[PDB]
Design a binder for this molecule. Structure first.
Ligand SMILES: Nc1nc2c(ncn2[C@@H]2O[C@H](CO)[C@@H](O)[C@H]2OP(=O)(O)O)c(=O)[nH]1
Length: 104
């Protein structure tokens, strides 16, 4: 059940999969939502060791289980590439500034 732990938020494989599908879809159609225009390029400034090739894109995953639609994105993100492969699940929770830490 608790496949990904972002601070206090708990996400299953299904939650991540659903969010990723939604984010990849908007990416494919060239659409964005929210004040920060998601999904958008994730440059991996943090230098996480992803097993899949770039380019990466960040998209909000909501603890409520809802699919992001432009409102408040929260602290967590799913990262995917052009092949719709999951690079990882990251969060602002437990990090300084606008930096990210990986969910475990
Ligand atoms: N922390 C962080 N920000 C990134 C990265 N790639 C792009 N950004 C964007 O660069 C800026 C400074 O962090 C923000 O606009 C941020 O977008 P988000 O705020 O949407 O994540 C990344 O790999 N890490």
């Amino acid at each position: 059940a608790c496949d990904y732990t972002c601070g206090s938020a708990c996400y299953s494989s299904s939650d991540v999969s659903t969010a990723q599908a939604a984010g990849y879809k908007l990416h494919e159609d060239g659409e964005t939502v929210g004040s920060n225009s998601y999904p958008h390029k994730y440059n991996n400034y943090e230098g996480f060791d992803f097993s899949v090739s770039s380019p990466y894109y960040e998209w909000p995953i909501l603890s409520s289980g809802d699919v992001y639609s432009g409102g408040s994105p929260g602290a967590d993100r799913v990262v995917f590439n052009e092949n719709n492969q999951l690079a990882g699940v990251i969060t602002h929770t437990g990090a300084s500034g606008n930096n990210f830490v990986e969910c475990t």
